[PDB]
């Protein structure tokens, strides 16, 4: 038994709300949240915008001195920071950013980093501001991770989409 409410059941592993990620961490504080990131960890707009701005800078201040000592990620990585006032952690996971003509081939590797975690609250990766066909990268989600995965759909509109076309 775990303290995620309101979720409609997907699978035997994945959970489905419509919820602002931000609002549902501040709840929850979830032993994880997922952060939609890029691989320079710049959190400017989209979920990262969001989920840094309710750290007050405090997630870019540490994602910039973690890029300093290690460089960036990899499309496809990840890394495990602070959650700051919202988790735990935060797993920052790099999907592929179809505005900047990344293969999509890598939002399988994207979600692969959700399995070293029992629990997440987190995103669907690669969609909103990354370009990405939402259905598609839930159907992703769904054949990929085996842990157990809640996500947030910050918009009403494509939340009821992504449960009515679901197979």
């Given at each position: 038994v775990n303290s995620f409410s309101g979720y409609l059941k997907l699978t035997d592993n994945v959970y489905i709300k419509n919820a602002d990620i931000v609002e549902e961490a501040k709840k929850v504080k979830p032993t994880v949240v997922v952060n939609a990131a890029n691989?320079?960890?710049?959190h400017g707009g989209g979920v990262?915008?969001?989920l840094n701005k309710a750290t007050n800078n405090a997630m870019q201040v540490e994602s910039?001195?973690?890029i300093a000592t290690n460089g960036p990620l990899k499309v496809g990585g990840s890394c495990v920071l602070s959650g700051h006032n919202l988790a735990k952690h935060c797993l920052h996971v790099?999907?592929?950013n179809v505005n900047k003509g990344e293969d999509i081939q890598?939002?399988?590797?994207?979600?692969?980093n959700f399995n070293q975690h029992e629990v997440l609250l987190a995103p669907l990766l690669s969609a909103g501001i990354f370009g990405?066909?939402?259905?598609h990268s839930l159907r992703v989600c769904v054949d990929t991770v085996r842990t157990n995965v809640y996500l947030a759909v910050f918009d009403k509109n494509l939340y009821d989409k992504?449960?009515?076309?679901?197979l």
């Open positions: 691989v320079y960890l710049k990262a915008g969001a910039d001195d973690y790099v999907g592929p890598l939002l399988k590797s994207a979600y692969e990405a066909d939402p259905i992504l449960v009515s076309s679901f």
